[PDB]
Design a protein around this nucleic acid. Structure first.
Ligand SMILES: Nc1ccn([C@H]2C[C@H](O)[C@@H](COP(=O)(O)OP(=O)(O)OP(=O)(O)O)O2)c(=O)n1
Ligand SMILES: [Ca+2]
Lengths: 933, 353, 352
DNA sequence: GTCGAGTCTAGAGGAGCC
DNA sequence: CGGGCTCCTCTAGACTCGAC
């Protein structure tokens, strides 16, 4: 009988899986623990509820190497990270001769022997390197020059685009334009993800054994700072606890060098020739730039020497380092549809911006007529603008007769043409127009000049005045201290945010526009997304009427993401692989396009750029999901697998919820579901819509995505006012009283439903050296109780669970790599958006990849239970709800990414069909439960 | 109503109130267009040509006759599609049988109303490969709608609707929301190849075009646009009485005038500036030749009704320093600018619009 | 003969090789014009417009329909004079009733041959009766100068005074085709007979202002056949080279690609192509053709067309920016920087 | 010697992700 | 006491440098 039940009747793991994972020998909970759990659940009304058992799962799991699961994971991580710790130790004991007096002006790699002799080499040929790459931003993303070091060797690299001057270089990058750097190798840098993207062999579809260590990641692991901590640190360099300042620094190479090595200050090039200089500037100052790059490399080497022992001490579990190594090899395949997406998104953005600018420019041009007669003093919107005027400053006929008249006219016109001597040499900018209209127009010298007030947008403070926006029939007025608002006439010397008296507008009252975050925030733009419901209701109205206001807000919502992300997305470093670099499987596949382009984008991820050791990527960890109304939201859908390949991945179901629940249960009694919160977490299926997210989304009419925010806020210290404001923002049909009532209902029972979890989190946070419950990773120095005492308490309490989730990600990556190497699954790591792991797998191994992902989730949950001493796993949280098998990155495998820039969808505009989501039973039926071929 | 009065007053429309009616304007039985209307239609046709033929390497002009002879007497043309299909095989050689390629033409077609209504039509016939026929149909729908909205003060009034024929062929129909309702200004039909096969019976070897490495019989995408109804749509869209036509569509770009005394001396400068602007491709209204001088307010109102972008006022002070008063219809604001840089400013304003 | 074969092959004239003949072309019964022929006719129309309507305040465009309704049932227009005469009253308000003024239009006119269609450029000049012959001679000289301006052999354009049955002064402009001399333009001093016929009674409407007095005008009809003028210029322009005047040539510059790499050179050629198009220079997109022929064959093909210059982009253009340039008039090849090509072409067109 | 058009920087408010 | 990030536009303020 595979069906098992704990003393609390919760369906535990299948018998075979329990024997293969935990084995016989687990200590019994005891009478007292079971009595406490039963009493708690009975008091909270959960003991008598029966639940239909989930079908049992019988799997022949891969053998576990150690005596228990912890030893298994330790052995796997040690096998993974052994070749790279050796290279790190090689770097830590390096004797490096001084940098050469003169750097070599030669394209490619050059090795500097003793005393500075320059010898040309093809590749550095080292097991370990400290690498820094300089890129001339004027000429694009192609690398300009680089310097690398190793034990007893200085290396320098120069590109053709630096040593040679030519009329045109290709704007479409190729691996032949990158730096050749590639059994295992370790590359160390301060933003090594940036330097990784400029390596030739890092864009091949097949993976490479080279891994990358980052000093920023290790700094955040050892002595990192929070964003609030970073702000305070920078302010203090220019809360009663300040001991953390002397043991922490910001993620700048100079500051890290000051913190760890503490030598002379690091010097930078004053002119910043790479960021804001031409290639000629770099050619003229080649030696100085090479010297500065070498200085940066030396500083990084010293920092790594000072950091590696500290990181290995504060993060002793090998799984942490193995996951950090695996998290820095992200890979996003793309094709010519990437260029199509860029072009179409830019075109749609330009069209919508042009419609908005047409409306605004018409309103501005028609407004200039109020200058006559000083009628602007009677306009309730534009009276406060500057209407100043600038004076202009100063310092039949015969053929012969017609020719003579034409020559006379031309000469007379040329005579007056020469009076330019008296004209001032600086052309005055629109003297005859009012100042406010003057500021909205480009100057004639501007190369991107467009007639009319082209410099006009909804974000400008004059746009609401031009559109004559009204809130409940009151004109919008801007206060420098209290943001936007409206004026209620009737003053002699309505209920809203408050009648602020700092404005002193005669015969009016200033009321701030209601803000989604409370009365302590200011409204900087009335065209925010949160005002679309108010525009539709009729409280917010535009002067021209009709759809002018609603269309403005709609276009703002459509182009808001692209406005903030077009520079990031368009400037993505895409390296297009030629036909030779592609695998034979891609070429021979029926979907192969001979005239198409195949390439990849390497995300520039900092593996540990958070106090919780989360990853950071400005674009791909910010990439919006596809929406019917968002322009360019199909960004992730453009990450499309090559022919013969699919993107197999999955997302963890209620990750931090279950981590908190298991911590609270293990602290209460050594069983799953001891506490009410743990029982609720297990008793629920996402397919049936009974999980906590869906239960909240049903109890209050908000969406499940908003229920995520609500629940995770409540867990991590959000008060009742925050919950009320969130409910009112996400559910427009609620009132203030109803929001307060539903806030109490979700906060009534949290001796409570989640008391034990809170106690465990506070106990771990307040210990002398807070550590992760699973892998034992220590918190940053700048957050220990000695350093900060009772400061940043919410940060550390959330850090417990968030770093536990990062450990979950580390375990998932290690287990997936182990399963792919053991059973020879022809796939590789694609991207990890925190708790979402995506793998680029061939079509022949997609179901095996799904089974490996399910086994990985099972083993990770079992490890979480084991390190807390529970010795069992519930069946509910044993496997993923569904594993996605899709040819493009999207939140769901069925949604056709129809956007304003992609109205026809992925299936029509491109050739991408719908994917499939499979649970454990379907995977077992499709692969017989075996990961073997 | 007032728009028609202004259009006939400013010679956009050339007719009396008997013929200047909505039904006659839409049908095409109205008399000919006034000189400003002719200039506006020329500008609209030039913009259409710039957008469709000039900047596309696959679009070439085609000459279709106004009558179709043979089977008994001949008839006037009702559409430009027939001539384009007749010239398809001949124009295949230009692109070296490479698809897609198009044949574009602007001309007058005759429609029974048995009164005959003459409509000037801009037609593009796109010979697209069969597999990308829907993709090219969507692309041309978006491109033509963006073109109609490019010169529109109210782009939302130009809409699109999906429609199907009796045979079931897919297609789109563009409209302009006139004050009385939506009127069909442009039609796109995803015709197959049966029309070409009917016009070219026999071996289909001639009709084969190159879609990559395969020879296919193209699907005919017909894009027909009514330039007269489009001009009326833009006149309504543009409509202080001022016809805010697009700077690239306005019939007359600039206006010249004489400010004060002496009368004779300013005429030479006005003539020189007139000749320079005409040599630089800027259409000028010679208001300095009007014996019946009027106040500047009346002149400004007249130029606003005529959609005059700028009013250059050469004065006696120009003889001293070379500064000429410049006013614009959009802002009604006066500016001072030197003679040497007026042409460059006008060219920049027209091109960057 | 050979010229017509070249025009049919190089897409000046449409139809099969046996579907075109001299009489069909002259009578307007040809199937049509090829894209190069359409562009040449459009260039001729633009030049005529620049010479007549542009640089003259008194000349205004007119829009006459292709058919005349009402009792003479309806029938196609045969001349553009009637539309201008019908527009005489409406167009009188533009000039504030100040004679003289003219109405010009380039439209297709239908002539019974079969039905023939001719593209005719008509000028109807409303003249005070005093200077009728002076303006007639002025227009004769101006039109003859315009015809001879683009002609490599201006002597082939002639003139001949003629008298009609009514005895009114008239002048005829011809072109000397190889078979013989053919009429391409005619001017007649028609007088107020037609204006009074179309406007009987109440001559107050027909009165204008000539020296602050009201005088009925005398009309001058300047009618020229642009299709036959296009044929005349094609014959004049014709080594198989069609040396059309740069203001009339349909395509100015031919753009091609040398050896590899294909993508980079195609991008450079596309940029140059877009630049030249934005600067009003028509370019033949010869770089899109994957199949390539001999350089001499390509030069001969471009010379059969009215291609002013041929530009070839190679690897050296990537290295330094020099582009091979060949001139149609003189078979000379020179290297020019790719950033100076636009200015050179514009200067050549303006000088021509 | 004064002064006004570029020019860099910092801060605020909005907006994407998990 | 939600937490952890990311980047953008807009605007005010202080600084610079050439022209009168
Ligand atoms: N507004 C948010 C969103 C996310 N997270 C954290 C908590 C989650 O555990 C983790 C992953 O986010 P998910 O969106 O995956 O949340 P869930 O895993 O709970 O939802 P699902 O079951 O849909 O995966 O990120 C958070 O704290 N606050
Ligand atoms: Ca999740």
């Amino acid at each position: 009988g595979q069906l098992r039940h704990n003393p609390l009747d919760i369906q535990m793991l299948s018998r075979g899986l329990h024997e293969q994972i935990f084995g016989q020998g687990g200590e019994m909970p005891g009478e007292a623990a079971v009595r406490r759990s039963v009493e708690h659940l009975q008091k909270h009304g959960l003991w008598g509820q029966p639940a239909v058992p989930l079908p049992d799962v019988e799997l022949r799991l891969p053998p576990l190497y150690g005596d228990n699961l912890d030893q298994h994971f330790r052995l796997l991580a040690q096998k993974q990270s052994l070749p790279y710790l050796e290279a790190a130790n090689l770097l830590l004991q390096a004797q490096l001769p001084p940098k050469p007096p003169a750097w070599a002006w030669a394209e490619g790699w050059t090795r500097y022997g003793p005393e500075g002799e320059a010898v040309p080499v093809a590749i550095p040929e080292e097991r370990a390197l400290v690498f820094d790459v300089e890129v001339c931003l004027a000429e694009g993303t192609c690398p300009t020059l680089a310097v690398a070091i190793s034990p007893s060797a200085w290396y320098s690299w120069c590109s053709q685009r630096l040593v040679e001057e030519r009329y045109s270089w290709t704007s479409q990058l190729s691996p032949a334009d990158l730096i050749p750097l590639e059994q295992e190798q370790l590359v160390v840098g301060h933003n090594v993800s940036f330097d990784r993207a400029h390596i030739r062999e890092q864009y091949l579809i097949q993976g490479s054994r080279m891994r990358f260590l980052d000093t920023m990641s290790m700094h955040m692991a050892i002595s990192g700072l929070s964003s609030f901590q970073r702000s305070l640190w920078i302010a203090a360099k220019q809360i009663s606890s300040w001991d953390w300042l002397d043991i922490s620094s910001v993620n700048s190479l100079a500051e890290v060098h000051r913190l760890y090595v503490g030598g002379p200050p690091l010097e930078k090039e004053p002119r910043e020739l790479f960021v804001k200089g031409t290639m000629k500037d770099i050619r003229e100052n080649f030696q100085d730039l090479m010297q500065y790059c070498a200085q940066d490399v030396w500083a990084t080497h010293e920092v790594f020497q000072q950091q590696l022992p500290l990181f290995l001490e504060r993060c002793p579990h090998p799984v942490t380092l193995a996951g950090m190594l695996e998290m820095g090899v992200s890979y996003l395949p793309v094709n010519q549809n990437w260029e199509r997406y860029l072009a179409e998104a830019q075109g749609t953005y330009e069209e919508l911006q042009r419609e908005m600018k047409k409306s605004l420019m018409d309103l501005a041009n028609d407004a200039c007529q109020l200058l006559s007669g000083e009628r602007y003093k009677e306009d309730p919107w534009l009276w406060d603008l500057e209407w100043d005027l600038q004076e202009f400053k100063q310092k039949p006929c015969s053929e012969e007769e017609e020719f003579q008249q034409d020559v006379m006219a031309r000469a007379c016109l040329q005579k007056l043409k020469g009076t330019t001597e008296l004209l001032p040499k600086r052309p005055q900018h629109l003297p005859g127009h009012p100042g406010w209209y003057r500021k909205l127009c480009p100057r004639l010298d501007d190369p991107a000049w467009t007639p009319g007030p082209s410099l006009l947008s909804l974000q400008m403070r004059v746009t609401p005045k031009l559109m004559a926006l009204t809130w409940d029939g009151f004109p919008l007025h801007y206060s420098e201290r209290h943001g936007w608002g409206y004026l209620v006439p009737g003053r002699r010397d309505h209920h809203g945010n408050g009648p602020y008296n700092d404005v002193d507008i005669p015969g009016c009252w200033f009321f701030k526009l209601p803000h989604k975050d409370g009365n302590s925030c200011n409204v900087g733009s009335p065209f925010a997304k949160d005002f679309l419901p108010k525009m539709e209701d009729g409280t917010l109205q535009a002067g021209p009427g009709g759809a002018s206001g609603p269309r403005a807000l709609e276009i703002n919502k459509m182009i808001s993401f692209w406005r903030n992300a077009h520079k990031r997305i368009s400037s993505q470093m895409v390296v297009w692989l030629p036909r030779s670099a592609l695998p034979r499987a891609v070429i021979r596949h029926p979907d192969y396009d001979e005239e198409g382009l195949y390439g990849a984008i390497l995300p520039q991820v900092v593996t540990a750029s958070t106090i919780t050791r989360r990853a950071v990527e400005p674009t791909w960890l910010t990439a919006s999901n596809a929406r019917p109304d968002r322009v360019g939201s199909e960004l992730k859908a453009m990450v499309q697998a090559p022919p013969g390949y699919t993107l197999v991945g999955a997302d963890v179901d209620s990750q931090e919820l279950w981590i908190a629940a298991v911590l609270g249960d293990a602290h209460f009694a050594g069983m799953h579901g001891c506490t009410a919160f743990g029982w609720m977490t297990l008793q629920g299926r996402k397919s049936r819509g009974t999980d906590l997210h869906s239960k909240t989304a049903t109890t209050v009419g908000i969406s499940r995505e908003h229920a995520k925010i609500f629940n995770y806020g409540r867990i991590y210290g959000a008060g009742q006012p925050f919950a009320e404001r969130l409910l009112m923002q996400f559910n427009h049909r609620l009132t203030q009283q109803e929001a307060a009532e539903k806030a109490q209902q979700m906060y009534a029972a949290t001796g409570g439903t989640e008391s034990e979890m809170f106690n465990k989190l506070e106990s771990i946070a307040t210990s002398d050296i807070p550590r992760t419950p699973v892998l034992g990773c220590c918190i940053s120095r700048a957050l220990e109780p000695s350093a900060v005492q009772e400061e940043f308490m919410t940060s550390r309490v959330n850090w417990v669970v968030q770093s536990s989730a990062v450990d979950y990600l580390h375990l998932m990556l290690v287990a997936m790599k182990w399963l792919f190497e053991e059973f020879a699954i022809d796939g590789r790591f694609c991207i990890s958006i925190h708790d979402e792991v995506r793998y680029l797998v061939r079509e022949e191994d997609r179901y095996r990849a799904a089974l490996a992902l399910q086994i990985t989730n099972l083993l990770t949950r079992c490890m979480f239970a084991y390190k807390l001493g529970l010795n069992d796993l519930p069946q509910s949280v044993a496997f993923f709800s569904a594993v996605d098998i899709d040819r493009c990155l999207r939140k769901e495998v069925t949604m056709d990414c129809k956007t304003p820039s992609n109205p026809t969808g992925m299936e029509r505009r491109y050739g991408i069909p719908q994917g499939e989501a499979l649970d454990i039973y379907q995977i077992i039926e499709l692969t017989k439960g075996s990961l073997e071929k | 109503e007032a728009l028609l009065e202004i259009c006939q007053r400013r010679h956009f429309l050339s007719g009396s109130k008997q013929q200047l009616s909505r039904d006659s304007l839409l049908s095409g039985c109205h008399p000919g267009f006034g000189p400003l209307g002719v200039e506006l239609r020329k500008n609209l046709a030039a913009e259409w040509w710039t957008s469709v033929v000039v900047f596309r390497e696959q679009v070439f002009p085609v000459d279709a006759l106004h009558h179709k002879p043979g089977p008994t007497s001949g008839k006037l043309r009702e559409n430009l599609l027939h001539g384009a299909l007749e010239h398809y095989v001949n124009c295949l050689d230009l692109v070296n049988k490479r698809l897609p390629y198009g044949l574009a033409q602007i001309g007058v077609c005759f429609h029974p109303v048995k009164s005959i209504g003459e409509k000037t039509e801009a037609s593009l016939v796109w010979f697209t490969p069969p597999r990308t026929s829907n993709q090219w149909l969507d692309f041309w729908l978006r491109h033509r709608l963006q073109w109609w909205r490019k010169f529109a003060m109210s782009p939302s009034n130009f809409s699109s609707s999906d429609c199907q024929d009796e045979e079931g062929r897919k297609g789109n129909k563009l409209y302009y929301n006139f004050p009385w309702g939506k009127e069909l200004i442009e039609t796109l039909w995803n015709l197959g190849d049966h029309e070409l096969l009917h016009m070219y019976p026999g071996n289909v070897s001639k009709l084969h075009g190159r879609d990559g490495r395969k020879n296919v019989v193209p699907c005919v995408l017909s894009v027909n646009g009514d330039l007269d109804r489009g001009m009326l749509a833009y006149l309504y869209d543009s409509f202080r009485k001022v016809l805010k036509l697009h700077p690239c569509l306005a019939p007359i770009k600039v206006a010249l005038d004489v400010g004060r005394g002496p009368t004779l001396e300013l005429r030479q400068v006005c003539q020189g500036l007139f000749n320079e602007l005409l040599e630089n491709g800027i259409s000028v209204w010679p208001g300095y030749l009007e014996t019946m001088q009027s106040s500047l307010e009346q002149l400004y109102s007249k130029y606003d009704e005529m959609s005059i972008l700028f009013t250059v006022l050469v004065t006696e002070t120009t003889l001293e320093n070379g500064l000429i008063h410049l006013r614009s219809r959009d802002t009604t604001m006066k500016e001072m600018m030197h003679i040497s840089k007026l042409k460059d400013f006008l060219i920049k304003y027209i091109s960057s619009a």
